[PDB]
Design a protein around this ligand. Structure first.
Ligand SMILES: CC(=O)Nc1nc2ccc(-c3cncc(S(C)(=O)=O)c3)cn2n1
Length: 836
C-alpha cells in the first residue's frame, strides 16, 4: 500500500523470472482471479501448520521396514552417535525408541529437554513421535549401513517463519489474420479451423473457404456449429488452427466464472514446426511483433447375464493405452453401476462418456452421487494419476482423483511431485483442486516447498506456454512460506545468476571442437574473484540437496570440462561447521541444455526402486541430483569416486584400438584395498547392473553413446547423461560375472534370476509405468506420436503375455545382447571421427 510495501513486488518478480503484474498476454482477468483465488488456500494452511514442526521438517516414512534390512538388523538393535565439541558418546537403541525420548535416557540416565537432535553436516532434524527406524535419513543410512552422527543444538527460531501478512446452436465469426513478414518460396493457400473440445474428444469440426495467402487475409465468416449452447461441457476448449498445417491458438469456451465468453478478441498464435501437451494451453504468444494474430467475434441399478459380465471384465483388465470400441463404450456405459464396484474401471468408464449431451453429464454425476467404493477403496496411485492425465477435462472427475491423493504422507508425494506438477499443464483452468493441493502440501512441510519451487521456476523460465500459470501458482507460494524459507531462495537466485555471467562469458571464446586453452581457464578463476567480492552471500543450499549448505569457493579446483557444450566443474566448501569429513561439494554447472528431460527421468528410476522395495528387493540405481535453475541452464550432482566406461577402456587400451575384455575386472581389483571388498563390490555390481537393464529397457534407452555409462569405484554403476541393442551389456560386464563368453557361474546364475524376478516385480505394476511414460512424453519431449512413441513401453512390459512367457522373453532379451559384443559400441566409436 506504500513505498516500502511496493518494493516487495520488485523482488518476487526477480525471483520468479516473470512479472505477474505485467499485462501483455491477457485477453482477461483469470490472471488475478487465480492469484486472489489463492489467498485463502495459502493462509488457510499457513496458519494450520505447527510452526516448530514446519521449521524442523523431520523426514519420516510409515511404510513397512524392508525385509533385506529388517533381517539385516543383525544384532537386532540400532546404534547412534551424538557430538558436541570433543565429547561424542555412542548409544545402544531399540527400533521403537522415539527420537524425542532417546534424550530421556541421556539427560536422566547420564546426567533440560529443550535441545533437539540434528544431523552432522545437514539441515536435517530428527524430532517427533515416530520411531527412529521411521526417519528417512536413518533408513538411507542403514540401507547402505552407515554410522549415525547427530549433534545437539537448539530448535531453530520459528519466529522467522513470519509471513508478510441465448440458447440454440453455437457459432463464431472468424474475421482475419496478420503475419507482418512472410516470404519463403512461391504462392500458397490458407484456411482456419474451429473445434469444440472436451479433452481431445472433439465434439465438432468446422472449416472456412480457402483464400490465397496475402500478408493480411480476411473472411468476415461466421461458423454455425452443430451442437447446442447449454450442451457445452465446462472446460470447453475452442481450438483454432490455420492450415496451409501451419499455426495454432486456443480459447476456453466457458469462463472461469461461468460466463459463456463474448466480445471481440485479438488473440496471437503460436507457431508450429516439424502429439504434445504444450498444445492445450490457455495462454497466447506474448510477442506482438512476429506472431500471427487471428481476430474473432463471439456474440452469445445394473445386474446382468454371464457371458456379458465375462465379456466385460475383459474390458476391465485391458491396459490404459489399449483402444476402446463403440462396441466396448456401450457395454460399460450401460452397466454403469455394475461398473462402479470395480475401481479398476474408472478411467475406462468416463472415457466412454461423450459429454455432448446435457442429459449424459447429469447421469454421469448420478454416477458420482454414489461414489461408494472409490472413496473407501485401497488407494492405488497409478489408477489415480490415470485420472489426472491428458484425457479428462471434467473439473469433477479430476476432483475424484485429487480426493484420493489427499491421503499420502510426504515421502510419497515427494516420489510423485514432478509428474503432478507437470500434470497442471492439464487441469483446464488455473485455480484448480490440484493446483491448490500442490500449494497445500508444499506449505504443510518445508522439503516439498523447496522442490516445488525449482519445479515451478523450471517451467516459468524456459516454457512460455505455462510461465503465466506457473508464475501465478509460485508467486502464491513464495509469499506464504515465510522469509525464513524465502531468504534461501534469494541466496540460490543470486548465485546461479552469478554462475551465468561467467558460464556465458567463457561460452564466448570457443574455437568449436573440444578444447580448453589456458586463456579460457586462466580467466575462469580470474572471473571467480568478482563473484568472491560482495556478490555471493556466504553460503547457499544445494538446489538438488535441500539440507546441504554449499558455501565458499574452491577456486583452485573449478574448471571447464572439454565437453562439446562448455560446462563448469565447480566445487564448494560445505559451510556447515559441524561436518564429519572433508571432501568438498562438486557440482556440475552446464548451459545450453533444457534439463526438465533428464530431471523427469530420475523420477522414473526412483519409483522403479520404490516399487522393488514392496517386493523386498534392491538394485542400487544411483539416481544423482539435478535441477533446472533458470533458463537454458542448470546444475547436476558430482558423484565422488566414479568414472565412465569410456575413460577406462581408454586407460588400459589405446586411442580406439580394439576393446580388451578383462580390463574391467582389474579396475575394481585395483581399487579394492581389502582382500574381501573385491567380492563385496562384485556383490554390488551384479545387483547394480541388473536394474540398469530392466529400467533402461522398459524406458527404451538402453543402447547409449558408449561415453555415457558410469561406475563408482565401489562396484556400483549408473547411466549418466540422458541428452538423447535393447540394453548396454558389454562383454566385460559378462566377464565381471564369471562368463568369458556364453557360459554360466555362481554370480551370472544370479544375474539372470535377479533381472527377471525384478522384471515381473516391475511388470506386476504394468499400468503405473504406462501412465507415467505417456504423461512423461506429453509434458517433456519433442514431437512424439500419440501412438508410435507412446506405444513402445507397451511392448517392453509385454501386457497380456502371462508370466512364463515374459520370464523367458527377458532371459532371451539378454541373449539379444549376448550375440552382438562390441560391434554396437565400436559402431558408436567410429560414429565419431569421419562418418558423414
Ligand atoms: C567423479 C564424477 O565425475 N562423477 C560424476 N557424477 C556424475 C553425474 C552426472 C554427470 C552428468 C550427467 N549428465 C550430463 C552431464 S554433462 C556435464 O556432460 O552435461 C554430466 C556426470 N557425473 N560425473
Amino acid at each position: 500500500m506504500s513505498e516500502e510495501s511496493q518494493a516487495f513486488q520488485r523482488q518476487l518478480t526477480a525471483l520468479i523470472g516473470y512479472d505477474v503484474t505485467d499485462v501483455s498476454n491477457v485477453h482477461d482477468d483469470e490472471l488475478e482471479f487465480t492469484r486472489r483465488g489463492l489467498v485463502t488456500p495459502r493462509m488457510a494452511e499457513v496458519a494450520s501448520r505447527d510452526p516448530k514442526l514446519y521449521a524442523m521438517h523431520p523426514w519420516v516414512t510409515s511404510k513397512p521396514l524392508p525385509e533385506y534390512l529388517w533381517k539385516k538388523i543383525a544384532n537386532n538393535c540400532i546404534f547412534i552417535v551424538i557430538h558436541r565439541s570433543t565429547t561424542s558418546q555412542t548409544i545402544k537403541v531399540s527400533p521403537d525408541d522415539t527420537p524425542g525420548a532417546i534424550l530421556q535416557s541421556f539427560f536422566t540416565k547420564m546426567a533440560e529437554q529443550d535441545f533437539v537432535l540434528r544431523v552432522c553436516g545437514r539441515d536435517e532434524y530428527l524430532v517427533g513421535e515416530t520411531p527412529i527406524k521411521n526417519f528417512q535419513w536413518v533408513r538411507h543410512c542403514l540401507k547402505n549401513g552407515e554410522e549415525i552422527h547427530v549433534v545437539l543444538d537448539t530448535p531453530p527460531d520459528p519466529a522467522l517463519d513470519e509471513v508478510r501478512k441465448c440458447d440454440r446452436k453455437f457459432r463464431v465469426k472468424i474475421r482475419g489474420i496478420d503475419i507482418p513478414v512472410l516470404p519463403r518460396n512461391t504462392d500458397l493457400t490458407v484456411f482456419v479451423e474451429a473445434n469444440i473440445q472436451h479433452g481431445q474428444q472433439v465434439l465438432c469440426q468446422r472449416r472456412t473457404s480457402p483464400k490465397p495467402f496475402t500478408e493480411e487475409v480476411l473472411w468476415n465468416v461466421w461458423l454455425e456449429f452443430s451442437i447446442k449452447i447449454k450442451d457445452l461441457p465446462k472446460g470447453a476448449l475452442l481450438n483454432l488452427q490455420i492450415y496451409c498445417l501451419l499455426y495454432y491458438v486456443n480459447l476456453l469456451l466457458i469462463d472461469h466464472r461461468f460466463l459463456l465468453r463474448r466480445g471481440e478478441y485479438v488473440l496471437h498464435m503460436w507457431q508450429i514446426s516439424g502429439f504434445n501437451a504444450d498444445k492445450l494451453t490457455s495462454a497466447t504468444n506474448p510477442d506482438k511483433e512476429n506472431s500471427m494474430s487471428i481476430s474473432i467475434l463471439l456474440d452469445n441399478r445394473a445386474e446382468m447375464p454371464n457371458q456379458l459380465r465375462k465379456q466385460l471384465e475383459a474390458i476391465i483388465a485391458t491396459d490404459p493405452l489399449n483402444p476402446l470400441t463403440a462396441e466396448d463404450k456401450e457395454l460399460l456405459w450401460h452397466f454403469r453401476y455394475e461398473s462402479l464396484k470395480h475401481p479398476k474401471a474408472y478411467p475406462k468408464l468416463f472415457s466412454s462418456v461423450k459429454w455432448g449431451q446435457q442429459e449424459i453429464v447429469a447421469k454421469t454425476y448420478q454416477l458420482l452421487a454414489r461414489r461408494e467404493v472409490w472413496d473407501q477403496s485401497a488407494l492405488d496411485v497409478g489408477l489415480t494419476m490415470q485420472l489426472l492425465d491428458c484425457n479428462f477435462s471434467d473439473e469433477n472427475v479430476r476432483a475424484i482423483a485429487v480426493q484420493k491423493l489427499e491421503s499420502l504422507e510426504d515421502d510419497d508425494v515427494l516420489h510423485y511431485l514432478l509428474q503432478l506438477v507437470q500434470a497442471v499443464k492439464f487441469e483446464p483452468y488455473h485455480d484448480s483442486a490440484l493446483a491448490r493441493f500442490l500449494l497445500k502440501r508444499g506449505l504443510r512441510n518445508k522439503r516439498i516447498g523447496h522442490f516445488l519451487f525449482w519445479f515451478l521456476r523450471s517451467e516459468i523460465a524456459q516454457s512460455r506456454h505455462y510461465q503465466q500459470r506457473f508464475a501465478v501458482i509460485l508467486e502464491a507460494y513464495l509469499r506464504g512460506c515465510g522469509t525464513a524459507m524465502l531468504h534461501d531462495f534469494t541466496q540460490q537466485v543470486q548465485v546461479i545468476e552469478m554462475l551465468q555471467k561467467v558460464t556465458l562469458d567463457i561460452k564466448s571464446l570457443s574455437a568449436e571442437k573440444y578444447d580448453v586453452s589456458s586463456q579460457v581457464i586462466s580467466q575462469l578463476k580470474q572471473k571467480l574473484e568478482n563473484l568472491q567480492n560482495s556478490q555471493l552471500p556466504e553460503s547457499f543450499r544445494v538446489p538438488y540437496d535441500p539440507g546441504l549448505k554449499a558455501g565458499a569457493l574452491a577456486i583452485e579446483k573449478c574448471k571447464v570440462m572439454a565437453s562439446k557444450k562448455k560446462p563448469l566443474w565447480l566445487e564448494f566448501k560445505c559451510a556447515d561447521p559441524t561436518a564429519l569429513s572433508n571432501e568438498t561439494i562438486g557440482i556440475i554447472f552446464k548451459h545450453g541444455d533444457d534439463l526438465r528431460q533428464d530431471m523427469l527421468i530420475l523420477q522414473i528410476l526412483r519409483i522403479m526402486e520404490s516399487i522393488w522395495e514392496t517386493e523386498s528387493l534392491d538394485l542400487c540405481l544411483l539416481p544423482y541430483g539435478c535441477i533446472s535453475t533458470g533458463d537454458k541452464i542448470g546444475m547436476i550432482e558430482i558423484v565422488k569416486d566414479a568414472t565412465t566406461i569410456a575413460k577406462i577402456q581408454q586407460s588400459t587400451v589405446g586411442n580406439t584400438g580394439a576393446f580388451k575384455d578383462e580390463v574391467l575386472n582389474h579396475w575394481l581389483k585395483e581399487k579394492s584395498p581389502t582382500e574381501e571388498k573385491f567380492q563385496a563390490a562384485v556383490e554390488r555390481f551384479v545387483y547394480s547392473c541388473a536394474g540398469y537393464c530392466v529400467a533402461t529397457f522398459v524406458l527404451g534407452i538402453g543402447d547409449r553413446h558408449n561415453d555415457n555409462i558410469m561406475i563408482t569405484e565401489t562396484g556400483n554403476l549408473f547411466h549418466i547423461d540422458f541428452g538423447h541393442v535393447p540394453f548396454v551389456l558389454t562383454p566385460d560386464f559378462l566377464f565381471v560375472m564369471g562368463t568369458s563368453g556364453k557360459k554360466t557361474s555362481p554370480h551370472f546364475q544370479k544375474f539372470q534370476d535377479i533381472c527377471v524376478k525384478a522384471y515381473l516385480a516391475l511388470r506386476h505394476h504394468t499400468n503405473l509405468l504406462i501412465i507415467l511414460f505417456s504423461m512423461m512424453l506429453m509434458t517433456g519431449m519433442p514431437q512424439l506420436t500419440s501412438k508410435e512413441d507412446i506405444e513402445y513401453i507397451r511392448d517392453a512390459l509385454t501386457v497380456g503375455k502371462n508370466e512364463e512367457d515374459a520370464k523367458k522373453y527377458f532371459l532371451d532379451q539378454i541373449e539379444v545382447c549376448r550375440d552382438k559384443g562390441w560391434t554396437v559400441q565400436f559402431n558408436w566409436f567410429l560414429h565419431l571421427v569421419l562418418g558423414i
